[PDB]
Copies of this chain bind each other. A is one copy, B any other.
Amino acid sequence: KWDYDLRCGEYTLNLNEKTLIMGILNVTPDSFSDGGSYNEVDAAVRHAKEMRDEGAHIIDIGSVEEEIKRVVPMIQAVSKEVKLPISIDTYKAEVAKQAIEAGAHIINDIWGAKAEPKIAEVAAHYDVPIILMHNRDNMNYRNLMADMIADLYDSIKIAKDAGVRDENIILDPGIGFAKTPEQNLEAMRNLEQLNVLGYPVLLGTSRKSFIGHVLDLPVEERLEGTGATVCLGIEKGCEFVRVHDVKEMSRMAKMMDAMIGK
């Protein structure tokens, strides 16, 4: 049981009543546009609103200048038209600042504050919850889980040293990153181990490659496989699940929650 809530500015996410669903926003860049066109932002608001209606609790919105021209226009519209906390999917320090300014409540660094250490400071400054996902430029592990926890801890070191509060820290195993198909199945089977570090954990496996490797199905045929990873993750104690199929995953999460007793 957590003795605190995830404080996200206007909104507050409770980590005990249920598994929090983070829906991946569908960004489809408009040609002839640096970012901001009616088509792009509108299609984005329709999705945000849609996911919001089918169970989402968070909306994850994903050069350095281009990235800002594209993401800012959406964080502005979505935050205004959809009453839900927004997280910015990036590792770059600048993009993270801009995004929180436009309205983003959470940071989502796929490189755990290691590719641009300054982003940890951006997070500490604005005092927003940050997601440190496991990642590395190689897949040569002595002991997968042992090294994952070691790498994660080093992201936590960079985060805390930057002034990040323990309560504004969330971990992610990094399923699908610097891991072979078999190594991903190993992380899944051992996810509970991350819990020893004492922080909430977010699981991102939606429609990923290792599900295709196992079921041998294309990307648009990985719904039942995503579900399985989600159920096993909730059962191993995950607080959040980052998915595409918000409607389907919400029911599975909810039914899971009832059974485990969350």
A5 CB within 8 Å of chain B:
no
Residue of A188, A249, A259 most packed against chain B (CB within 10 A):
A259
* Complex interface: chain B residues within 8 A of A166 (CB): none
Give the shortest distance, in Å, between A210 (CB) and chain B (any CB).
Answer: 8
Are B235 and A251 in contact, CB atoms less than 8 angstroms apart?
no
Q: Which of B215, B229, B256, B261 contacts A228 (CB 8 A)?
A: B256
Q: Name the CB-closest residue of B to A256.
A: B228
Q: Mark A242-262, 1 if CB is under 8 A from B, else 0.
A: 000000110110111011110
Give the shortest distance, in Å, between A171 (CB) and chain B (any CB).
Answer: 19
A167 CB within 8 Å of chain B:
no
Give the shortest distance, in Å, between A201 (CB) and chain B (any CB).
Answer: 16
* Complex interface: chain B residues within 8 A of A231 (CB): 227-228, 231-232, 235
Q: How far is the CA of A51 from the CA of B101 in the complex (A)?
A: 54
Are B224 and A259 in contact, CB atoms less than 8 angstroms apart?
no
Are A232 and B256 in contact, CB atoms less than 8 angstroms apart?
yes
Q: Which of B214, B232, B249, B252 contacts A254 (CB 8 A)?
A: B214
* Complex interface: chain B residues within 8 A of A252 (CB): 224-225, 227-228
A169 CB within 8 Å of chain B:
no
Are A189 and B227 in contact, CB atoms less than 8 angstroms apart?
no
Q: How far is the CA of A200 from the CA of B51 in the complex (A)?
A: 40
A217 CB within 8 Å of chain B:
yes
Are A261 and B185 in contact, CB atoms less than 8 angstroms apart?
yes
Residue of A211, A217, A227, A254 most packed against chain B (CB within 10 A):
A227
* Complex interface: chain B residues within 8 A of A229 (CB): 255, 259
Are A251 and B232 in contact, CB atoms less than 8 angstroms apart?
no
* Complex interface: chain B residues within 8 A of A256 (CB): 228, 232
Q: How far is the CA of A185 from the CA of B249 in the complex (A)?
A: 19
Q: How far is the CA of A251 from the CA of B222 in the complex (A)?
A: 9
Q: How far is the CA of A189 from the CA of B260 in the complex (A)?
A: 6
Q: Name the CB-closest residue of B to A249.
A: B224
Are B254 and A215 in contact, CB atoms less than 8 angstroms apart?
yes
Q: Which of A207-234 contact B (CB under 8 A)?
A: 211, 214-215, 217, 224-225, 227-229, 231-232
What are 13 A-B interface contacts by the 8 Å CB criterion?
A: A185-B261, A188-B259, A189-B259, A189-B260, A189-B261, A214-B254, A215-B255, A224-B252, A227-B231, A228-B231, A228-B256, A229-B259, A232-B256
The 3 closest A-B pairs by CB, nearest first: A231-B231, A224-B251, A228-B255
